[PDB]
Design a protein around this nucleic acid. Structure first.
Ligand SMILES: [Mn+2]
Ligand SMILES: [Mn+2]
Ligand SMILES: [Mn+2]
Ligand SMILES: [Mn+2]
Ligand code: NA
Length: 327
DNA sequence: CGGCATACG
DNA sequence: CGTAT
DNA sequence: GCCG
């Protein structure tokens, strides 16, 4: 009843087991802070299974047979059902290690390995990081300088205003080029931590050199606070606000139209959905999937897709619209 | 036992 | 390493 | 942590 891959089942944005999935995702996050990507994946998968169930779980017996639910994840659910709280989860929640790792890794430019080094060096606050600016890359400095704004949820009004200015810069840089909203907002989310845009042109090859031209034109309009030939740009915008402005993270990607369905699929997510889809592709169908194409390593050929639907079908998967990819 | 998605900057 | 989904 |  429950397939093992997240790409084989609908996962809507609103589901019926937020309490259980949120607890399992704390353990997944903590597993990553300690350097166990395997444990992180399992806990993420178990949480995602609960998001795909049609009703709330109220008895431990409702977990029998579900993939990715073993002794550990079942004990967590069990404790939550009986006592409303899981000791392990609360221990992690309150721990200085978890709180400081979450604080540091939330910084744009800081990952687990960087945050772990700083923690081992005794650092605990953002001010501690500001004290010693020599130990900061230019990317981390931008992330730290705009951390407050970047912690404010991005709203749909922000998306619409951002798309207008991106579309204007793109149109000035290359007539006929298009801008597609991707990421969580394409999956139907009402908030987010950034905005993701995918850019192409209907005539293969015309998009060459586009992203630098777009960035220059945004910078000349005073819209760029930070950015780094390139096809992916992880920026921070200076988004006008009534009488003021706020910093917003914006990802711009350029793809040739031949790759557009694969880039759209990859950049629409969710993150777990794409990992599971790529694992399914390779492990179950012997095909290599990424945001550029779908590769057959035996024939040494690429699958010519015209749409996301074509990709799902070539993989033998029932099509899922973006709003059902919230694994 | 060993894998666990797969790229670009 | 960081980033992205 | 779970599973092929
Ligand atoms: Mn008990
Ligand atoms: Mn996003
Ligand atoms: Mn993004
Ligand atoms: Mn993301
Ligand atoms: Na980070």
């Amino acid at each position: 009843w429950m397939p093992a891959y997240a790409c084989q089942r609908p996962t809507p944005l609103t589901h019926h087991n937020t309490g259980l999935s949120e607890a399992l995702e704390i353990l997944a996050e903590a597993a990553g802070f300690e350097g166990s990507e395997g444990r992180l994946l399992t806990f993420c998968r178990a949480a995602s299974v609960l998001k795909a169930l049609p009703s709330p779980v109220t008895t431990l017996s409702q977990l029998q047979g579900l993939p990715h639910f073993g002794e550990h994840s079942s004990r967590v659910v069990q404790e939550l059902l009986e006592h409303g709280v899981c000791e392990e989860v609360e221990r992690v929640r309150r721990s200085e290690r978890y709180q400081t790792m979450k604080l540091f890794t939330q910084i744009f430019g800081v990952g687990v390995k960087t945050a772990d080094r700083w923690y081992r060096e005794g650092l605990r606050t953002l001010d501690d990081l500001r004290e010693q600016p020599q130990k900061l890359t230019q990317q981390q400095k931008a992330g730290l300088q705009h951390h407050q704004d970047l912690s404010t949820p991005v709203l749909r009004s922000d998306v619409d205003a951002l798309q207008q200015v991106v579309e204007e810069a793109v149109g000035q840089a290359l007539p006929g080029a298009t801008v597609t909203l991707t990421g969580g907002f394409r999956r139907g989310k009402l908030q987010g931590h950034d905005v993701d845009f995918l850019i192409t042109h209907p005539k293969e090859g015309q998009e060459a050199g586009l992203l630098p031209r777009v960035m220059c034109r945004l910078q000349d309009q005073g819209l760029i606070l930070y950015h780094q030939a390139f096809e992916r740009s992880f920026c921070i915008f200076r988004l006008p606000q009534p009488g003021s402005w706020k910093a917003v993270r914006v990802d711009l990607v350029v793809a040739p139209v031949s790759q557009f369905p694969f880039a759209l699929l990859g950049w629409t997510g969710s993150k777990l959905f794409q990992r599971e889809l790529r694992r399914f592709s390779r492990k179950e169908k012997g095909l290599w999937l990424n945001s550029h194409g779908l590769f057959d390593p035996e024939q040494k050929t690429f699958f010519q897709a015209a749409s996301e639907e074509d990709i799902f079908r070539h993989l033998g998967l029932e099509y899922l619209p973006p709003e059902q990819r919230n694994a």
